[PDB]
Design a protein around this ligand. Structure first.
Ligand code: VTY
Length: 270
């Protein structure tokens, strides 16, 4: 394996000709895609990778300056796509990875045939002019909790992010990946995500975007999906699903997998 492949736990599965890249969100890893991957093996070559800072990655590679902005993660994605020699791909970014691929696509639009966003937001904090879902006090509270008892925070956060029954399998799975992060990395990364503001780069997007989210998502009001639709600088489409949860591809795969497959297969009218 190449040096980049190894560092990000890169996997390339399936026997298709076209590439599809699945990029996971905060607190989880490439296993979040477990219900989707079996349906792509015949049509594509599926690229899975882990973000630096996930519990599956080496904590000594986490460079706090590099990842102080989402650009740092976008550089990692480009490096992965280069090492693998992708010509073009369909990119599926979950949570923060939606914006990471968006940033990457502005530097290299040739690499991206289409972006599919799941549980995406360009900004979580409110503005007298924009509703992201959170005030600064909400954040201060979250971070005080994380810093004071990470193990306890993971147990209470997991059911909230996942939604539905608090003793479900998906909650256990997310709870476990959450606690596998080094607490100071988890704290730093979630702060970086919650403070971010990508609104101004949306009009520069030149790759069509499919914007998918649960109707009940603790971190993404439904109006943020409309916001991304309005401000993305090219063709885009919204699909709000009748599901609850920030990781719906994991907690409601029976419902969510067909939606993602639909947006992989069909294209938006130019
Ligand atoms: C999983 C997730 C949390 C959200 O705030 O952004 C993400 O990446």
């Amino acid at each position: 394996m190449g040096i980049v492949e190894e560092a990000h736990n890169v996997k390339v599965l399936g026997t298709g000709s076209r590439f599809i890249v699945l990029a996971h969100g905060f607190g989880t890893d490439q296993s979040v895609w477990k219900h989707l991957v079996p349906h792509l093996l015949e049509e594509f070559r599926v690229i899975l990778y882990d973000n630096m800072g996930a519990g599956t990655t080496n904590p000594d590679y986490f460079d706090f300056e590099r990842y102080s902005t989402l650009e740092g993660y976008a550089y990692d994605l480009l490096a992965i796509l280069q090492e693998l020699r992708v010509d073009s791909c369909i990119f599926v970014g979950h949570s923060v990875s939606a914006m990471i691929g968006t940033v990457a696509s502005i530097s290299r639009p040739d690499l991206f045939a289409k972006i599919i966003m799941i549980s995406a937001s360009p900004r979580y904090l409110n503005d007298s002019n924009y509703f992201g879902g959170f005030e600064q006090e909400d954040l201060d509270q979250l971070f005080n909790a994380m810093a004071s008892n990470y193990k306890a925070w993971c147990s209470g956060f997991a059911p909230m992010a996942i939604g539905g029954d608090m003793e479900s399998v998906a909650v256990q799975e997310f709870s476990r990946t959450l606690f596998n992060m080094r607490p100071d990395i988890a704290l730093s990364v979630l702060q970086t995500i919650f403070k971010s503001d990508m609104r101004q780069i949306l009009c520069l997007v030149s790759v069509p975007c499919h914007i998918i989210q649960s109707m009940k998502d603790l971190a993404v009001p439904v109006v943020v999906a409309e916001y991304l639709h309005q401000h993305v600088g090219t063709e885009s489409i919204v699909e709000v699903m009748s599901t609850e949860g920030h990781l719906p591809q994991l907690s409601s795969p029976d419902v969510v997998i067909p939606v993602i497959l639909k947006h992989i297969r069909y294209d938006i009218v130019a």
